[PDB]
């Protein structure tokens, strides 16, 4: 049918500062198998309601996929604020779509901490909706030059999550998938039955 069950049943997953998008088309997707999920800790929707999606056709779904800390899931909602919404992945205040998340402690936590997953800590200004920034520019927090490597008052702009086993449920890794929908009057290769 469609890639959704493979985006969910995926082995590898992306860091939120470099959040990875799938364009969906050519499609006929069963959203009821998604909302039937026993793993999904979160399945928020905005504009739409889960049982309605087999009635709604669309031009395009974007499925956006990334890993964040389990309490930062709060920030993956329309118009929110906090480090992830402000500096990594912003949903617009008029977002239509769904936010799916589940605890991935068994995949993404590693002993002594998994340092492979990162988020952007430093940005001169907040992100626009659906903006992305993959840069490694050394962050000039000082009034003086900083010139390509970190030191006195300047920094590598990413921070590693270090995801531990145990260590409290809100602090465990959560895989997040966001389903976003788009319309310009043409070629609806997405529907239900």
């Amino acid at each position, epitope marked *: 049918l469609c890639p959704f069950g493979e985006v969910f049943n995926a082995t590898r997953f992306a860091s939120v500062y470099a959040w990875n998008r799938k364009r969906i088309s050519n499609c006929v997707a069963d959203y009821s198998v998604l909302y039937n999920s026993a793993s999904f800790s979160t399945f928020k929707c905005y504009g739409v309601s889960p049982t309605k999606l087999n009635d709604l056709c669309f031009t395009n779904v974007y499925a956006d996929s990334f890993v964040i800390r389990g309490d930062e899931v709060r920030q993956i909602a329309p118009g929110q*604020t906090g480090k992830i919404a402000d500096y990594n992945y912003k949903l617009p205040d008029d977002f239509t779509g769904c936010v799916i998340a589940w605890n991935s402690n068994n995949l993404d936590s590693k002993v002594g*901490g998994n340092y492979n997953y990162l988020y952007r800590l430093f940005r*001169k200004s*907040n992100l626009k909706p659906f903006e992305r920034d993959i840069s490694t520019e050394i962050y000039q*927090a000082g009034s003086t030059p900083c010139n390509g490597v970190e030191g006195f008052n300047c920094y590598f702009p990413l921070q590693s999550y270090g995801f531990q086993p145990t260590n409290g449920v809100g*602090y465990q890794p959560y895989r997040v998938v966001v389903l976003s929908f788009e319309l310009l009057h043409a070629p609806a290769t997405v529907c239900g039955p």
Partner: antibody
Framework: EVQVVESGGGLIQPGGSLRLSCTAS????????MSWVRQAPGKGLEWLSV???????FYTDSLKGRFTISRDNSKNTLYLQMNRLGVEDTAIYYC?????????WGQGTLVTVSS | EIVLTQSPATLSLFPGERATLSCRASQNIGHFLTWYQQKPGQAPRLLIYDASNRATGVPARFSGSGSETEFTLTISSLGPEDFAVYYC??????????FGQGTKVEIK
């Protein structure tokens, strides 16, 4: 070492309001995470409020709507508008700048509230 | 919300001795914890971050140990200048978060 330097310390009363200020020697206050923290005589540290680099700002439940953090990027300065006080809001207030491995505190400034 | 308990309230060791300062958390806060020094009349100073890393310019005698719900600042030998108040803070919503009530060192 970087010096961050509070100002606007002084006296008020029950009913009234005040506004603190801070400046920084070799860092840009708009680019940094900046907070206010207070320490009353004979009491522990209370973290008050923060402004993130992109201007997002947050507050402790003890003071939501009483105090309001803000900055001016042009003056390289930070402000705590501090309204509707009581006698117990008397403390040293510290301006503090944070980075992942570093936390730079100003010398602190007194505020007192009484008759 | 999280609250932090420090033990002891006042330590009373002599200079030269190895010292341990203890912090316990009302929640499992992972590694997200800070320790600060404070001399009387000075502002606080960062010692330890992420339960265990040592901040730049802090002498190598300081160390951080423990995780999750139980944490300890440890000093390999007290200098006479290490007599101070010490505060833990949870930084699980960095840079925000609650402080401990603090611990002193004093003798006679």
């Amino acid at each position: 070492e970087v010096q961050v330097v509070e100002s606007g310390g002084g006296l008020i009363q029950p009913g009234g309001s005040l506004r603190l200020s801070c400046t920084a020697s070799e860092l840009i206050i708009s680019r940094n995470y900046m907070s206010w923290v207070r320490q009353a005589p004979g009491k522990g540290l209370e973290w008050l409020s923060v402004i993130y680099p992109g201007g997002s700002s947050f507050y402790t439940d003890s003071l939501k709507g009483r105090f309001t953090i803000s900055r001016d990027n042009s003056k390289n300065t930070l402000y705590l508008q501090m309204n509707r006080l009581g006698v117990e809001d008397t403390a040293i207030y510290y301006c503090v700048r944070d980075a992942p491995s570093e936390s730079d505190w100003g010398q602190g400034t007194l505020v007192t509230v009484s008759s | 919300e999280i609250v932090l308990t420090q033990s002891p309230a006042t330590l009373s060791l002599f200079p030269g001795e190895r010292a341990t300062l203890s912090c316990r958390a009302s929640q499992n806060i992972g590694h997200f914890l800070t320790w600060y020094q404070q001399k009387p009349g000075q502002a606080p100073r960062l010692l330890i971050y992420d339960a265990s890393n040592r901040a730049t310019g802090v002498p190598a005698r300081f160390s951080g140990s423990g995780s999750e719900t139980e944490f300890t600042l440890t000093i390999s030998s007290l200098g006479p200048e290490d007599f101070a108040v010490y505060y833990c803070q949870e930084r699980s919503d960095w840079p925000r978060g609650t402080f401990g009530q603090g611990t002193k060192v004093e003798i006679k």
